[PDB]
C-alpha cells in the first residue's frame, strides 16, 4: 500500500559500462568541500539547486501554461464544482427551516438567545 | 540652543486644544431639552458651555 517499493532487482551484465555516474557527484562534492572549507567565508553558499527549485515552482508555470488540454479545463469540476453544491444545501435549509419557523412553532419559551 | 525642535512641538496640543474649544462656544443652540439635559432653573447646565 503505497508502494511496492522494489528493493531488490537484477544486474550483471545489463549495460556494465554505466559506471562513473558517481563521477558527477564526486565532482560536485570536490567542488563543494573546496567551497565549504575556507578560513574567511562568513555566509552561506548559493547552491542553485534550491534556486532552480523555487523559481521553477513559484514563477515559470504561467509562462509555461497553454490551455491546450481539457485536463487544465478540468478545474471547472474542481473550482466551480463544489461551490455549486454548497449553494444547493443552504437554500434547502433556511427555507424548510423557515416555513416551520413561521407556520407552526418548534422552539420553546426560554429561547431568548439566538 | 533652547531646542524648539524638541518639546515645544508637543506644546501644540494646547494650541490645538485652544481651537478645540472655539466650536462648542458657537454650538450653543439648545438649552431646551427634556432628558437631563434640563437647563431648568440652575447654574449647572449653563456652565461648561
Amino acid at each position: 500500500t503505497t508502494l511496492d517499493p522494489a528493493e531488490y532487482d537484477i544486474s550483471s551484465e545489463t549495460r556494465k559500462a554505466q559506471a562513473e555516474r558517481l563521477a558527477i557527484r564526486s565532482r560536485l562534492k570536490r567542488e563543494y568541500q573546496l567551497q565549504y572549507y575556507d578560513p574567511s567565508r562568513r555566509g552561506v553558499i548559493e547552491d542553485p539547486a534550491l534556486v532552480r527549485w523555487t523559481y521553477a515552482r513559484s514563477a515559470n508555470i504561467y509562462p509555461n501554461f497553454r490551455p491546450n488540454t481539457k485536463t487544465s479545463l478540468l478545474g471547472a469540476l474542481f473550482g466551480i464544482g463544489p461551490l455549486v453544491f454548497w449553494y444547493y444545501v443552504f437554500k434547502t435549509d433556511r427555507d424548510r427551516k423557515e416555513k416551520l419557523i413561521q407556520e407552526g412553532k418548534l422552539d420553546r419559551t426560554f429561547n431568548i438567545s439566538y | 540652543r533652547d531646542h524648539w525642535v524638541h518639546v515645544l512641538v508637543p506644546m501644540g496640543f494646547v494650541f490645538g486644544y485652544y481651537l478645540d474649544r472655539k466650536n462648542d462656544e458657537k454650538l450653543t443652540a439648545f438649552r431646551n431639552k427634556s432628558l437631563l439635559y434640563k437647563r431648568e432653573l440652575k447654574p449647572n447646565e449653563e456652565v461648561t458651555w
Binding site: 419559551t109 426560554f110 429561547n111 431568548i112 439566538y114 | 431639552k33 427634556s34 432628558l35 437631563l36 439635559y37 434640563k38
Partner: protein
Amino acid sequence: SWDKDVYPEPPRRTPAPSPQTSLPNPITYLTKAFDLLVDRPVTLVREFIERQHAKNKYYYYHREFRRVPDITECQEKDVLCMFEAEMQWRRDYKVDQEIVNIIQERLKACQQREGESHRQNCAKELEQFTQVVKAYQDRYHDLGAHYSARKCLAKQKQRMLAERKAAKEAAAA
C-alpha cells in the same frame, strides 16, 4: 448589601450534636485551634481600617432621569423629537437585559440550596422564569432586526404585527 426580597433564601435549619460514642473524634482538635490563628491578623486589621476609613467620608448620588416624552411622538420628518424617543428607548432595553439577569440568578439560588430533590420543590422558578423569557423575545427583541437595534423604526412594528395581525385576523377573534 441588598434586600432579601430580591434575593430570597429559606432560613438555615442546620442540625447539630449527634456524637453518641467515645470513639476519638478529630473535630474538637480542628475548630478549637485554627480559628484563633486567623482571628488575630484579620479581625484586628479589618477593624483598624474601619476606624481609619471612618476618618472621612465620600459621596455619590442616585442618578434619576426625566421622562416627559414616550413613544408615538412625533411627525415623520422630525429629527429632534425622534432623537429623544430613541434616548427614551435605548435605556428601556439595557435595563430590560438585566432584569433577566436577576431572575436567572434566582434560579441559581434554589438549585444549589436544595440540590437533591430540586425538581418537585421550590415550586416557583420554572413557572416564573419561563413566563418572563416567553415575555421577552416577543415585542421587546427585534428578531431578527437586532443588528441595527432599530429604535422605534421596528420596535413598534413587531407590535404593529401584534395588533394588525393579532387579535382580529384569527377568523374570528
